[model samples]
Target: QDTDFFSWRRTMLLRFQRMETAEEVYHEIELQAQQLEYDYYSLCVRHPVPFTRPKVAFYTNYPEAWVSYYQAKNFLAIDPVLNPENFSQGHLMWNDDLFNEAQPLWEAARAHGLRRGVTQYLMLPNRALGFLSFSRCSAREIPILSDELQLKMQLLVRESLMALMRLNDEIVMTPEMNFSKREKEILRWTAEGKTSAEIAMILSISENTVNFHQKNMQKKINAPNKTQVACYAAATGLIHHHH
Candidate 1:
């Protein structure tokens, strides 16, 4: 059953690729995470640029009272997870020793059922910090560094950040690239793993027409090849799988 983690991740990634909205991926991950004993999750992205508020996609199943209290009290200013030193580690585990400096906050969190938690974060290329935390009241506290369990959470963090970018369309465009309806359809088909000939047949267009659209996309994105173009389109959320 340990090997099932691979299937879980695969299924989640495939489902995420097909999702058209951020919340679609958001709710699905929380629902899927219960298999690993994590019942609550939170995701946020803090950009480095001054004066910008962090972006929170959603908070999964954390008690609203605690959330409201935490906000009202501005606990974020003192949360141990936000310490500059911990930020360098790119992750944090909830434990007495780890939260020794914030006993008040820790106690309050546990009182609200956030008894055990682990946070995985990333320093992104765009100078943003991405945080993904998972918590559950019942399970044994997340291990400091369980080989497989930690890996799974890290994957969750990475994938969640990508999903956030896809949802926000944060990928900077070089210039205004106008994609015709046919071009968009071709990209979607390409992302679904269809060959040019297969796409042509499905769209009732010649194989050359399929390639033509791809080439145009390639030029627009400054991609070197068809595969790169397909990847770029998929990463930008320009393609979504139907089923």
Candidate 2:
């Protein structure tokens, strides 16, 4: 029988809410995987088309030889578990044929007595994005993932992704305004010590519109006034005067 993935997921959500950093989140995931008896687990992040090498945190209890083999070959880059997760948009699993395709790597893995096991992939995306894979060793496991487990894992992945995105946003949008592209451009002009009328002439917008944007920007940034906004923008490298 499969584990109670739904209950496990709920616990993950509670833990994620309390997580403060990416490293902290990954550490929790490692602990969960161990509790669930998974031999290997990993999180792979996709940037655009190609994905970064899967960053794995495993607990195989294997000999040093097997560990050395995996590291020396850099198998994480081409592991079937990670490749599909990176290229595909959602969750996925691998079968015997897929495992055979990675025969040489499997041979090394076999040294640890790992055989047929179920592998689950979960893709988490936001401003910065990634995926996670969980692998359990079963002598003849046959990848028995049920529809219900798949659904639960999907929900878990979604929640984890949102939590990560929120943390990332807080880092980038700390100033609260979260200025748009155009507003940043206008802020650049302000940092140049350009008057509203001069900015209006340069940007081809009306002086009233420029002033409107400036005021809105000031409000979003929570600046006491426009001069403070200009100072903050300059210090933050939103605009360049000396250059």
Q: What is the TM-score of each candidate against the true structure?
A: 0.61, 0.51
Model 2 regions lying over 4 Å from their true place? 1-11, 21-24, 49-68, 85-89, 122-129, 142-145, 168-180, 183-243
Q: Write the per-residue lDDT of candidate 1 for residues 116-202, one digit (tens) a residue.
A: 887778765444566777888895644535666667767777776676556654431212336887888887777778999999888
Give the winner by lDDT.
1
Return the lDDT, model 2, position 209: 87
Error of 1 at 127 (Å): 2.2
Query: RMSD (Cα, Å) of candidate 2?
Result: 10.2
lDDT of 2 by residue, 1-243 (tens): 246765766677787787777666656656655765666665445433112331233433344675687789887766776565333435565555666667777766666655533344443322223455566666555333456545654654555545555676332221333677777787777776788898888888888888888788877666566777766555444454311
